[PDB]
Design goal:
One of its GO terms (biological process) is cerebellar Purkinje cell layer development. The chain has 31 helices and 20 strands. By secondary structure, the chain is an alpha+beta fold. Among the domains are: about 120 residues, Methane Monooxygenase Hydroxylase, Chain G, domain 1; about 55 residues, Alpha-Beta Plaits, CATH 3.30.70.1590; about 110 residues, Methane Monooxygenase Hydroxylase, Chain G, domain 1; about 80 residues, no CATH class. The strands form 5 sheets. It has a 7-stranded mixed β-sheet, with helices on both faces. Strands 1, 2, 3, 4 and 5 form a 5-stranded antiparallel β-sheet that branches.
Length: about 900
């Protein structure tokens, strides 16, 4: 079993002309086409056997059995979401969780422990190409490491998926490989720490990364690891001050409040869950997980990392202070200014932090802008929110850098790195607020990075094969969608327009939509809802598809005004921890997100990207079950189907000369010689013989490039020709055998003796009981095959096959029935010749008896009035014997004896012998 069935397809665990159709049921099912009516098709299903209606644009072709469970899905002759779903599903139920789709590496979580990832297997993937071994996460790691040394440039591995997809587990395997090849454990201890401060419960997921995680493994010039460091991108700080319904802020908040001791609550000035404004929907629990115990788990996790008690407690103060920000109450009364009638709050805030309570009160209400600017009620709450968002973000970046200090660097060694990007995939909800626009905007550029990468990797592949073909950059397809979101003015995009509407207080979410539609309604990737008044305000076309955005509270969520008076107070804060966070002082949310993404893209574009796709088979977290719709939705989000969309335009199927020859040679039997080889021209002869259209193929240096659907045709022509060639072979060998045996059965020469005759009698009876039956019921098999051939032949939409020289089943048994009547004619003529041979035997026996009886008489009478007495005895015995000898010879002639003169002459010779006997007496 182990580990042989979890990798190789042949080692794994266990012709109706069908096509894929849309379904709910299973993701896709099979159906027989039959009748077509107008522009629509009417089909009928296979495994169930029920009938249903679909369109003709909804029909996706199915791959031949040859392409079942491919390791690389670029090898598929039929490229569509249905085939992609099938192949992945077929491999998953077979125990294979790894599959390559184009450049992508697709890993579906088994939710089991597979006996892979051992030192033997790691050493077995070393120095090998990707196709030389079955799909595995190690090959992608191997691909990165081998390219880093040879291609001299840094590497990056982009992992897409969720937190419960084992994306952390998959990242461990990547590091596991790179560690064994180049010769730590604490890097796995950093994960639960960041998980606390960086993850939160969403609607779809109880644990979701709100930040990008970039793990940089540094290698020296010799290829050995000198250390590692973590970088974080696109942290969501808006989740701290507010959350969507049923959604929670970061875990650490709920862990602290529930898990802290009595002394901790008094020192951190902690309150109830319903007492904090920045906590939406009060206290939300999580199934299977409890925040109280996770708090202690989080503490010790930081202890192992080497965090001192003072450092940890300092972080817990900041977390507490972030929540305390919201509890500050500003009020409004009838001149325009902010007011804080409640002094009990902001005392806690200034105590938790290092700020002077009097300086702060003056600063937050009336900031000093480089002199003494006034702020309103609306400005104050926003300024407070931003301070909480900024402080928590600075807390996070500090936690990262603090972890990086706890990572061992055993060599100074200015080095090169291989990055691992862990980021939340494309998010599509039934609502899709501002946070969803941001995570889609960054994933848009990420998928663009793939398209450009595939564009570069393939165009250098065509050159290596010496094939000249020109295609536009596939990355340019996402460019209009990106410019729709990101551009300052052409005319200003969704982000740029949102920044402008936040500048004016009287603007609303409604005026933002109206201006967005007005500014660009012309954009191809911009669309509006169908009719009436839809929930969502507008829609944007992505690579994943069309998503519906609602602009509610977008102006509120985009506000990130920074108070420069309060920021300076936090920089000058008496608390050394707080002072360090705010040490570096320099503004809309979307502006910072665009800024932070540009920083991430800059680093990735300077490296060589690799892509791993983690898929969740089911929501039930159980093994052996795969939800097809869940997988399909993910395939649209991660860009796997987008990768499929690109290769179809080109020549996706690439087959080497020899394996193309071996497979399809039966289609062109006499085209190819008896194997004078050279192997390239053998394929050029096959294509010429097949008369294959020149637009459907390209001949490279080592390989032949094929369009999608071409191999599907050739594979189908093979199946028909295979059974046809096998039939015409065994048919001729059967027919000729009959013709050769029947010709032998009509042979009338049985031999010259009686022993020879029964020799054929024993051979003929042993023929019917031995040789005939296998040849006899082979006729019944060939007729069954001919019928089976005629059936599968007309399922291909073709014409029936005509067998030449009477090889048809009805002409076979006709020759067989003619053969069986010729056996008795051979057998009956055998017993006739048998009696004849017996009648010759007795006649020849008497002939020899008479002749050799006179022999001794002639001899013993040669010893000699008694003379003429013995002389009379001579002529009487002579006449009597001669008359009897003549009687025997006469009976032999009518029996057609062929030794007649042989006996007759020998008789006449004895007449000379008897003549000597009569002469001797005289």
């Amino acid at each position: 079993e182990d580990p042989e069935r979890y990798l190789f397809v042949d080692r794994a665990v266990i012709a109706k002309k069908l096509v894929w159709i849309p379904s709910e049921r299973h993701g896709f099912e099979a159906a027989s086409i039959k009748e077509e009516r107008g522009d629509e098709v009417m089909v009928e299903l296979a495994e169930n056997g029920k009938k249903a209606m679909v369109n003709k644009d909804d029909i996706q072709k199915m791959n031949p059995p040859k392409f079942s469970k491919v390791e690389d899905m670029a090898e598929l002759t039929c490229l569509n979401e249905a085939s992609v779903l099938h192949n992945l599903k077929d491999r998953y139920y077979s125990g294979l969780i790894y599959t390559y789709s184009g450049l992508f590496c697709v890993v579906i979580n088994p939710y089991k422990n597979l006996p892979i990832y051992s030192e033997n297997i790691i050493e077995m993937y070393r120095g090998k190409k990707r196709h030389e071994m079955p799909p595995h996460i190690y090959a992608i790691s191997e691909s990165a490491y081998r390219c880093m040394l040879q291609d001299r440039e840094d590497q990056s591995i982009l992992c897409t998926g969720e937190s419960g997809a084992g994306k952390t587990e998959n990242t461990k395997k990547v590091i596991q490989y790179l560690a064994h090849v180049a010769s730590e454990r604490q890097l796995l201890q950093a994960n639960p720490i960041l998980e606390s401060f960086g993850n939160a419960k969403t609607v779809k997921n109880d644990n979701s990364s709100r930040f990008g995680k970039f793990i940089r493994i540094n290698f020296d010039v010799t290829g050995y690891i000198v250390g590692a460091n973590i970088e974080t991108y696109l942290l969501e700080k808006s989740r701290a001050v507010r959350q969507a319904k049923d959604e929670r802020t970061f875990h650490i908040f709920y862990q602290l409040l529930s898990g802290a001791g009595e002394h901790l609550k008094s020192d951190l000035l902690l309150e109830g869950f319903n007492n904090y404004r920045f906590l939406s929907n009060g206290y939300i629990p999580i199934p299977g997980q409890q925040d109280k115990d996770n708090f202690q788990e989080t503490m010790e996790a930081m202890h192992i990392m080497g965090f001192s008690h003072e450092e940890i407690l300092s972080m817990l103060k900041v977390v507490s202070s972030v929540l305390q920000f919201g509890n500050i109450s500003f009020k409004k009364e009838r001149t325009d200014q902010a007011s804080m009638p409640e002094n009990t709050v902001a005392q806690k805030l200034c105590h938790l932090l290092g700020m002077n309570v009097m300086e702060f009160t003056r600063a937050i209400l009336t900031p000093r802008i480089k002199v003494q600017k006034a702020q309103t009620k609306e400005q104050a709450d926003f300024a407070v929110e931003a301070l909480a968002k900024a402080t928590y973000e600075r807390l996070f970046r500090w936690l990262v850098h603090r972890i990086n200090k706890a990572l061992d660097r055993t060599k100074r060694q200015g080095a090169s790195f291989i990055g691992i990007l862990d980021i939340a995939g494309f998010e599509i909800f039934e609502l899709n607020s501002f946070e969803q626009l941001c995570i889609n905007y960054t994933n848009e550029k990420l998928q663009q990075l793939f398209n450009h990468t595939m564009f570069i990797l393939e165009q250098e592949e065509y050159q290596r094969e010496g094939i000249e073909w020109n295609f536009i950059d596939f990355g340019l397809d996402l460019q209009p969608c990106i410019d729709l979101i990101e551009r300052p003015a052409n005319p200003p995009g969704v982000l740029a327009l949102l920044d402008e509407e936040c500048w004016f207080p009287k603007a609303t979410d409604k005026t933002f939509v109206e201006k967005l539609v007005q500014e660009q309604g012309s954009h191809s990737k911009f669309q509006k809802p169908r009719q009436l008044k839809d929930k969502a305000d507008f829609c944007i076309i992505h690579y994943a598809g069309k998503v519906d955005y609602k602009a509610d509270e977008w102006l509120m969520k985009n506000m990130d005004p920074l108070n420069d008076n309060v920021a300076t107070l936090l920089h000058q804060s008496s608390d050394r921890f707080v002072a360090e966070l705010w040490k570096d002082v320099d503004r809309t949310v979307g502006q910072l997100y665009k800024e932070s993404l540009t920083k991430l893209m800059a680093t990735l574009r300077n490296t060589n990207p690799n892509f791993v796709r983690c898929i969740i088979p089911n929501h039930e977290k159980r093994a052996g079950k795969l939800d097809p719709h869940l997988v399909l939705d993910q395939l649209r989000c991660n860009g796997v189907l987008e990768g499929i969309r690109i290769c179809r335009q080109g020549f996706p199927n690439r087959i080497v000369f020899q394996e193309f020859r071996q497979r399809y040679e039966i289609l062109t039997p006499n085209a190819i010689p008896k194997g004078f080889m050279d192997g390239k021209q053998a394929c050029e002869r096959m294509i010429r013989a097949l008369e294959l259209d020149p637009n459907l193929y390209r001949i490279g240096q080592s390989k032949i490039f094929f369009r999608a659907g071409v191999l599907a045709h050739l594979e189908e022509e093979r199946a028909s020709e295979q059974t046809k060639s096998d039939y015409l072979k065994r048919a001729n060998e059967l027919v000729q055998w009959i013709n050769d045996k029947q010709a032998s059965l009509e042979s009338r020469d049985f031999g010259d003796s009686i022993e020879s005759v029964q020799s054929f009698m024993n051979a003929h009876k042993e023929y019917k009981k031995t040789e005939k039956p296998p040849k006899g019921q082979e006729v019944s098999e060939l007729e069954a095959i001919y019928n089976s051939l005629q059936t599968k032949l007309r399922l291909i939409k073709r014409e029936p096959f005509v067998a030449p020289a009477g090889l048809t089943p009805n002409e076979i048994d006709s020759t067989w029935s003619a053969l069986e009547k010729a056996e008795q004619e051979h057998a009956e003529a055998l017993r006739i010749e048998l009696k004849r041979q017996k009648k010759i035997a007795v006649l020849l026996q008497k002939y020899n008896r008479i002749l050799k009886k006179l022999e001794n008489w002639a001899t013993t009478k040669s010893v000699y009035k008694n003379l003429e007495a013995f002389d009379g005895e001579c002529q009487s015995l002579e006449g009597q014997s001669n008359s009897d000898l003549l009687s025997i010879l006469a009976q032999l002639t009518e029996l057609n004896y062929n030794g007649v003169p042989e006996l007759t002459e020998r008789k006449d010779t004895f007449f000379a012998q008897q003549w000597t006997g009569v002469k001797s007496s005289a």
